[PDB]
Amino acid sequence: EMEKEFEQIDKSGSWAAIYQDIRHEASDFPCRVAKLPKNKNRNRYRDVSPFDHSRIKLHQEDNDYINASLIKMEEAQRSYILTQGPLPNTCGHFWEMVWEQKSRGVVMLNRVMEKGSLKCAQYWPQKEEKEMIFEDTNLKLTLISEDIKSYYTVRQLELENLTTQETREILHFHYTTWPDFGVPESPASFLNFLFKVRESGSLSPEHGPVVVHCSAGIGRSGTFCLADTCLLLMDKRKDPSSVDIKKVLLEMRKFRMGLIQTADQLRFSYLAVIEGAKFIMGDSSVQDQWKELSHED
Ligand SMILES: O=C(CCc1cccc(NS(=O)(=O)O)c1)NCc1cccc(NS(=O)(=O)O)c1
Ligand SMILES: [Cl-]
Numbered sequence: 001e002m003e004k005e006f007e008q009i010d011k012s013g014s015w016a017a018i019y020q021d022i023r024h025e026a027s028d029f030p031c032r033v034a035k036l037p038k039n040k041n042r043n044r045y046r047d048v049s050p051f052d053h054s055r056i057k058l059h060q061e062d063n064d065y066i067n068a069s070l071i072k073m074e075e076a077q078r079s080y081i082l083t084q085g086p087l088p089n090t091c092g093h094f095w096e097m098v099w100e101q102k103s104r105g106v107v108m109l110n111r112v113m114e115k116g117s118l119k120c121a122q123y124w125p126q127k128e129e130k131e132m133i134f135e136d137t138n139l140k141l142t143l144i145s146e147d148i149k150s151y152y153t154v155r156q157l158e159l160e161n162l163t164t165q166e167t168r169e170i171l172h173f174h175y176t177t178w179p180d181f182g183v184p185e186s187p188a189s190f191l192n193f194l195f196k197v198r199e200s201g202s203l204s205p206e207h208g209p210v211v212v213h214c215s216a217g218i219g220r221s222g223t224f225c226l227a228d229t230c231l232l233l234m235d236k237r238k239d240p241s242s243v244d245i246k247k248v249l250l251e252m253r254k255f256r257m258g259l260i261q262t263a264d265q266l267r268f269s270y271l272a273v274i275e276g277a278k279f280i281m282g283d284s285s286v287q288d289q290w291k292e293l294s295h296e297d
């Protein structure tokens with residue numbers, strides 16, 4: 001049971017060894033397509049590839065490759081698309097994938113610049129009046145509005161398929177203060193944000209899978225999806241004790257490599273799940289408290 005386990009791990013100081021066990025148990029499947037010569041410039045990181053079996057295929061034509069994985073959580077009945085931050089030559093692909101997969105929401109857990117380097121292209125317009133056209137994929141993207149909070153921004157985007165002129169609203173949930181290889185500032189600030197995504201309807205099974213990305217699409221993104229799926233599983237069962245967190249992370253790792261990149265990101269996942277369980281089990285008021293504690297204003 002997760003809170004008993006948390007305490008024994010903390011008491012014994014053994015997060016490093018627990019996280020290592022995950023690494024040695026994790027699935028290893030091939031990534032032959034990601035490693036083809038023609039795709040080298042579609043990958044941000046040499047050592048971070050989608051498995052072939054779970055990769056998202058673009059419905060082009062010339063080259064169907066994007067560095068993106070469908071994490072299909074069968075028992076939880078929720079799917080997510082995890083991807084790297086788009087590169088200067090893959091921003092059209094990224095929006096093509098959102099359109100073809102019918103996603104309603106994009107969760108971004110990194111900043112464009114982190115520690116002096118460019119970890120993600122500027123793939124969305126910053127000003128209403130300066131829309132983006134992806135000529136390769138025939139898509140147009142316009143900023144509709146934004147709601148800037150102290151550590152995250154929500155944007156309403158309109159994505160238009162220029163071939164059909166159909167338009168869709170995409171909500172962009174941008175967490176701007178989660179350091180790379182780090183953890184959010186508190187369970188509260190993390191959960192206040194996750195529940196904003198949830199409240200938007202972006203995670204509805206009536207939409208395609210939510211797109212989640214950081215820079216590589218594995219550390220911060222795996223921590224976010226792990227916490228959400230564990231909360232979903234105890235919610236479906238109304239039974240916090242039924243959730244095995246490390247088993248859940250190993251199931252997710254069948255779909256994309258490297259999910260959760262440090263032992264402290266694992267520890268933080270336990271914290272966010274233990275805390276979020278209070279809301280799932282019917283203490284509605286904790287949501288207001290997370291909002292206060294997060295200092296979003
Ligand atoms: O090469 C890296 C860093 C990848 C990377 C590079 C840059 C940023 C981020 N962070 S993210 O944006 O939070 O994902 C992550 N890590 C080693 C690595 C890669 C792919 C898989 C594993 N497997 S693991 O079992 O050791 O976790 C380990
Ligand atoms: Cl940014």
Ligand SMILES: [Cl-]
Nearest residue numbers: 113114115116
């Ligand atoms: Cl910087």
Ligand SMILES: [Cl-]
Nearest residue numbers: 087118120121
């Ligand atoms: Cl970039």
Ligand SMILES: [Cl-]
Nearest residue numbers: 114115179180
């Ligand atoms: Cl950072």
Ligand SMILES: [Mg+2]
Nearest residue numbers: 126127128129
């Ligand atoms: Mg203006």
